[PDB]
Design a protein around this nucleic acid. Structure first.
Lengths: 51, 117, 144
RNA sequence: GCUUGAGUCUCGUAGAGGGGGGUAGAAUUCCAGGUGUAGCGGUGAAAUGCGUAGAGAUCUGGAGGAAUACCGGUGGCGAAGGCGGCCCCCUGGACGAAGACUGACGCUCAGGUGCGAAAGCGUGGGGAGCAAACAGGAUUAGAUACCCUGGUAGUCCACGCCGUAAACGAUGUCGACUUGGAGGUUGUGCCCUUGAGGCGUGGCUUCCGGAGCUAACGCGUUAAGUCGACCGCCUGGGGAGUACGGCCGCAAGGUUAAAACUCAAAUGAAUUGACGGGGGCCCGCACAAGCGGUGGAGCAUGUGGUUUAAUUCGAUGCAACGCG
């Protein structure tokens, strides 16, 4: 989101975009309402997060 | 002509095409340029190169307004957008704000099915 | 090249001008293992090139070859990629020699002397090959 | 009679448990208007489609419907199906702490009754998105598909029906006993709290494992271990959960449920290999980078075929075809 111009800068290099929206949240809402694949995608995501 | 001196660069990167619209702070468009209207139809209109030449071409065609400052508003994902704002400060603009204004529903409408490719 | 990174073998320089560049040019021109014939053609053709352009020998050659060196060259993508210098002048010589074999003059020394002379003011066939390569890599610039 | 089973009362706790009502913010679509101009959309690539009657982009105002990002978690609640913004109203259960009370009031359950995703059906609304059917464009040998552009029922609400699912921990309910470890979640007591305290005691739950069991795989105090009570169901594969009959249902169909005939297997788990348009690593003139050929011409020679009295026999993907 917003980043004001600095007094002495060439590149703003805002990381605001990365910490939230671009990578996951919009690519997720491109495709189908299931209820079913998310229960198993989250099941195997939390079953993969193991030592 | 009309000498606005500050605007907003609405860049609308999608997966297939980036479309850059330079406007004023009221929201009235002053001139636009798409990646698909700069040659390279098809698999090549969704690249960072096509977006940057789209932004170069949208920096042209607003010379009649004397824009020096502009905010950048970014929609959608895309191979564009990042390169796009680069082309803007390669065209003498003082880039002030970079907001990302991608529309995110708060679980609204059902998205389409697709793609068993 | 699957595994083996390689060295390279050292060519003897030219017996008239000491130029390994021109030595590789007589190797590009040589057919059927006949090197004497090819160096005769190169000495005659570049000798009339030095007489025609009036510059000198291998700076007339180096200008005429400087106008034909490619800059960059090209799902099925044709990506543009930057040419290495040894490959750069290797392609230069291959295009000069090939275009000189295409010409319709009398002797090979006249075909290649006229091809290097047509490349000195960059209007020959090898410059059309270089402009063709550069149109392919210029059209497809969108892949890097 | 008695309290160790079951239940009642007191006080709290956590919770997407249920039903009714209201509201909020993002976003999609549509409508009206401003700017603005040549494309937009889409794909592996395209085209159909939308667009100089001004689209797409962008700003303002409005309408409407559905769903409720982040929190969000092998987190929670529910008998199961299932339940996710926030607020109110009505309401069910669970768990914990101390004490009091009843006093075996318990467990299971054929028939019976209730609840029961989704799709579907009936009547009446609603209809933004999505989308069976359908239409067009592609792809293809074909493409009644996958992909693209549209798109109706439906999905949403009220009431009634249906009555099923891989309705699944493929594991009936209730109770007892039998080594451990790491967590999560929700109670609570005690003790310098003198941290990111310590020490205990319950409820639910996740992962790994011991004995034991198991065909093996695995289960493993939430058992598939060791027992008890009651219920449901099984008896080779197919035919067949089908036909006939009954009951139910508006219908779709649901439920109960055969036989003739036919096969000598069908099946489970695991092993070795092979294979994969599975994954990782690696090689070879394998590809790439090049140079010269073959396929075109004439001839040489071998072969197939044809011919012949015979055209001797053998070699025939690679690895037969100037081969024996």
């Amino acid at each position: 989101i917003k980043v004001r111009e600095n007094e002495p800068f060439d590149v703003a290099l805002r990381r605001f975009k990365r910490s939230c929206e671009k990578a996951g949240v919009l690519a997720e809402v491109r495709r189908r309402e299931f209820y079913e694949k998310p229960t198993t995608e989250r099941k195997r995501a939390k079953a993969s997060a193991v030592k | 002509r009309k000498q606005v001196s500050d605007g907003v660069a609405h860049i609308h990167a999608s997966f297939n095409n980036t479309i850059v619209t330079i406007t004023d702070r009221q929201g009235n468009a002053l001139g636009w340029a798409t990646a698909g209207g700069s040659g390279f139809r098809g698999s090549r209109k969704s690249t960072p190169f096509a977006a940057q030449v789209a932004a170069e071409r949208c920096a042209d065609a607003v010379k009649e307004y004397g824009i020096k400052n502009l905010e950048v508003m970014v929609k959608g994902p895309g191979p564009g957008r990042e390169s796009t704002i680069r082309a803007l400060n390669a065209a003498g603009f003082r880039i002030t704000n970079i907001t990302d204004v991608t529309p995110i529903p708060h679980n609204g409408c059902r998205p389409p099915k697709k793609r068993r490719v | 090249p699957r595994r083996r990174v390689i060295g390279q073998r050292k060519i003897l320089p030219d017996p008239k001008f000491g130029s390994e560049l021109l030595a590789k040019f007589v190797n590009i021109l040589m057919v059927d293992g006949k090197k004497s014939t090819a160096e005769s053609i190169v000495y005659s053709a570049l000798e009339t090139l030095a007489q025609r352009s009036g510059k000198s020998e291998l700076e007339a050659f180096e200008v005429a070859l400087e106008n034909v060196r490619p800059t960059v060259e090209v799902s099925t993508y044709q990506v543009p990629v930057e040419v290495r210098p040894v490959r750069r002048n290797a392609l230069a010589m291959r295009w000069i020699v090939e275009a000189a074999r295409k010409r319709g003059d009398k002797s090979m020394a006249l075909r290649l002397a006229n091809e290097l002379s047509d490349a000195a003011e960059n209007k020959g066939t090898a410059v059309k090959k270089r402009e063709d390569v550069h149109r392919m890599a210029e059209a497809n610039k969108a892949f890097a």
